[PDB]
Amino acid sequence: DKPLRKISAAFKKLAIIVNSPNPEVPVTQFSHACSLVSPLFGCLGIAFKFAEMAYVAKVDDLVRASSSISTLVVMMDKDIEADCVRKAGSHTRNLLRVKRGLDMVKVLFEQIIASEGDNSLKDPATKSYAQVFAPHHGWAIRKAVSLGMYALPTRAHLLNMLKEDEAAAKIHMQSYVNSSAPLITYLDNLFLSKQLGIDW
């Protein structure tokens, strides 16, 4: 089906889990949902090429992890026990970056919705990247991203690539925004509650 619909369906499900008492988020289900977001970065063009190493490789690792590890909590606790939380390539470091990817797409969608009537994606792309990723990327990446903003598809072109009209895309984006918000909060709080921080 259409990429935004796959996304909204999968995250609705995740929202139910996190909004319930004693949530257990399976690594399989979380990593599959996160993989549905990947095609979005590609639709945005060269500006978001960083997403392959920054997001896709990370989801790939969680996909791998999911065969032997039950939940995100158990996954994090294993890395804590092994004292390898901030190590390059740890599941937990990867989870934190995946969280940022989910957040950037959330903010992007919010801004696209807020700017209905402007056929340019420049502000929404620039704003969300600035809010979510800019504080963690080095100079060269930030400069490259900014330059790549001239290569964004128009708003109408993007809708066409995602195979939706304005009304339908609005609903599915809003749905992801509503679903992903408590998930992102859930994830932040796992890090915060285990005294790991979220700014590294």
Ligand SMILES: CCCCCCCCCCCCC/C=C/[C@@H](O)[C@H](COP(=O)(O)O)NC(C)=O
């Ligand atoms: C012919 C020219 C082709 C143009 C180049 C295409 C875009 C290149 C953008 C590459 C972005 C690389 C980002 C690297 C990802 C991670 O390995 C690295 C470290 O991963 P980490 O955040 O520590 O887990 N992340 C950062 C932002 O330093």
